[PDB]
Design a protein around this ligand. Structure first.
Ligand code: SAH
Ligand code: SAH
Ligand code: 5NR
Ligand code: 5NR
Ligand code: 5NR
Lengths: 334, 335
């Protein structure tokens, strides 16, 4: 668990095909990038581009398609070699240069006019890749250079997870299929499925959402102090009113990023088309009954785990109705 | 280590999800339910040992079938749940949950019957069978009943439709996004087929390229089956392919059979039969091999305990497809 060792296990996660298949099969994600780049054709055409964490090289090829004279495809995972092949195969080794290793130590022969990166982990910040994109902003991007995407926003809403509700109810159904009453295991099932401290990644829809979603932070990637803030913790307070009666199981958070125009939003909301990011769930220890107009408020902080700086931690303080304020501390599931 | 390897194995059964998964599997749970009931005459008035009772469900079916007493032995912390359930259905006086390994537990007597659901992925992953046989030798009366009484293992060549699309994915990129990535096909094959892990996945009869071959039969009451099985089980197989297909390797699966009352009841994990939570276990070739109608596929397979972890299934495979040279691959159960 040295920094080197942990860096090297993280990179190796990207050296297998399955994640790249998943990213690229994510049409919502991949198109937002393709379209987001192509619409900035104006500021790209003949200009220079650093793709932070190029993976298979897809986004770097999009940039060349938008008219960039030269692209630096920087990547620390062994997948750089696959990227190199994709570039040679599409006839582009002259305009797209694959560079192995970390963006923090890579040596480019010049400053760039723009940066592209798909750096977003589950709950936006799991992986901590944003520090790497910001390190690269400060070290390689020219004064008033373009960032794609340029900003990110984070959102929270209380939920009544219908899937979880079905799973907790399961035990009460055992009697009618098999003739054995197992309804007494509901508490156990609740302790197992809600009373842990893991961030749970799951796909929700409208019918899980108990109120108006609230934005609790906004990250302007050009902003001065943003590096320091990520390490100290990003987040904010929130409040909303419940729509009606329901067992509330906790909250979901999700994010969007925004590319500038020639104004394109990539959203991971449960009201919008599904992405491989799904949403990140923060379950309370047990369900709480809510009603129409039940106040639910609190404060949320996303920050690095203590033992692993690439692992997402969420500190959550919250209040439901007339219940006393409570506190829960979560870390991203393995 | 050992105590340690075991506490870790038992801790995988202390969470709710695996029990939910097992009990939501109606094919499994009904087969036990009905396997036990069909055996009413031999349990009525008798004593049973439920090896790995879990939430206690199987012990309760034995009581519902008329067993005078059931000893529910369970080494995972889930035994506390089994007790709560036994008490809740009003059965404390008839089903006794006994915490701990079946190996060291103290029953107050020998039993007339053992019931156990001990089957891992690929039948023998977990190696719970050892536990069941130890209990049989130690605690089962002579002439005693086992449930299920037998197990059989089947292999067949396959073309995994899902895998095919995933290998095909890279050739389709061009059309979805105007970037040719067909050249990653080889890379995908390496990652997806060129490893040495047994892959657990659900197939359908359409993934199957020939007639399934039984390669091993395990008769649980056979004395000396314990030693026999140290070496490993398996055998040779042969079959002929149905048609043109890209062959990706083999699927293996099992069934278990309960004795008739009423005749024998089989619980199958075949891709041709209703899906169960075992799925099948897939043994992939390093790359696909194109086969045709009547292409001969032959080989040999041994399922054996991995060297540093006896609870981890190892499969050794020898095989020949058509006119290609004989090949070899050594597989171990995924994590
Ligand atoms: N500091 C760093 N330097 C270079 N690459 C990095 C990095 N941190 C993360 N990465 C890489 O960044 C990638 C993010 S996933 C996105 C890959 C590709 N751009 C695509 O859109 O499909 C991974 O390939 C990961 O290995
Ligand atoms: N040596 C041993 N002694 C007691 N229990 C064991 C054991 N080896 C495995 N087990 C337990 O056996 C169970 C297998 S799963 C079957 C659970 C339950 N009988 C049902 O049908 O749903 C697990 O709960 C596991 O913890
Ligand atoms: N820019 C990262 C976009 N995705 C990548 C896939 C998910 C994380 C993951 C990495 C590696 C292996 C498995 C899973 C979620 C974030
Ligand atoms: N008698 C075991 C029947 N199932 C139970 C679950 C599967 C193995 C597993 C155990 C524990 C956690 C995850 C997965 C397959 C075998
Ligand atoms: N150690 C006591 C004897 N058991 C008896 C049952 C055997 C089960 C098995 C066979 C083959 C592969 C894996 C698992 C293993 C040894």
């Amino acid at each position: 668990r040295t920094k080197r060792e942990r860096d090297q296990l993280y990179y190796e996660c990207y050296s297998d095909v399955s994640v790249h298949e998943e990213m690229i099969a994510d049409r919502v994600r991949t198109d937002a990038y393709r379209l987001g780049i192509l619409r900035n054709w104006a500021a790209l055409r003949g200009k220079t581009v650093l793709d932070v964490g190029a993976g298979t090289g897809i986004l770097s090829i999009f940039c060349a398609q938008a008219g960039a004279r030269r692209v630096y495809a920087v990547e620390a995972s062994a997948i750089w070699q696959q990227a190199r092949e994709v570039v040679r195969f599409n006839g582009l080794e002259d305009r797209v240069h694959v560079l192995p290793g970390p963006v923090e130590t890579v040596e480019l022969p010049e400053q760039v006019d723009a940066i592209v990166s798909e750096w977003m982990g589950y709950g936006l910040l799991h992986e901590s890749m944003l520090s790497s994109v910001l390190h690269a902003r400060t070290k390689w991007l020219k004064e008033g250079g373009l960032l794609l995407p340029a900003s990110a926003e984070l959102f929270i809403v209380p939920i009544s997870d219908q899937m979880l509700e079905w799973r907790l109810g399961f035990w009460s159904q055992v009697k009618q299929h098999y003739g054995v009453d197992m309804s007494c295991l509901e508490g156990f099932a609740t302790r197992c499925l809600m009373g842990h401290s893991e961030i749970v990644v799951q796909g929700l829809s409208g019918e899980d959402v108990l109120a108006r979603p609230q934005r609790f932070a906004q990250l302007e990637l050009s902003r001065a102090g943003l590096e320091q803030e990520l390490e100290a913790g990003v987040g904010g307070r929130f409040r909303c009113s419940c729509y009606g009666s329901a067992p509330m199981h906790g909250f979901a958070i999700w994010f969007q990023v925004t590319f500038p125009g020639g104004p394109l939003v990539l959203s991971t909301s449960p009201f919008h088309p599904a992405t491989h990011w799904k949403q990140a769930l923060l379950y309370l220890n047990e369900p709480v009954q809510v009603e129409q107009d039940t106040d639910v408020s609190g404060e949320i902080t996303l920050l690095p785990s203590r033992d692993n700086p690439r692992r997402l931690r969420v500190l959550l303080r919250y209040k439901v109705g007339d219940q006393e304020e409570k506190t829960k501390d979560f870390a991203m599931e393995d």
